[PDB]
């Protein structure tokens, strides 16, 4: 094990920030979502095996 983390050179390391930005689902986006949701319901979603 030669594993040293990235804070060994503290005071010489920029910080980290995370910006959270949303995005609404447009009318056509939700329309296609519902269309493929119906297709998945007909197919049984291919999510059971």
């Amino acid at each position: 094990l030669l594993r040293r983390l990235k804070a060994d050179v503290e005071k010489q390391m920029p910080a980290k920030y995370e910006h959270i930005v949303y995005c609404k689902l447009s009318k056509r986006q939700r329309f296609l979502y519902d269309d493929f949701m119906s297709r998945a319901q007909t197919k049984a979603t291919l999510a059971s095996g």
Binding site: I20, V21, Y22, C23, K24, L25, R30
Partner: peptide
């Protein structure tokens, strides 16, 4: 990118009270 509950004009105007 986050798919939230279908809203717009909320980037910082909910955050101007959240500070």
């Amino acid at each position: 990118f986050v798919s939230e509950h279908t809203i717009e004009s909320n980037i910082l105007k909910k955050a101007n009270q959240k500070r």
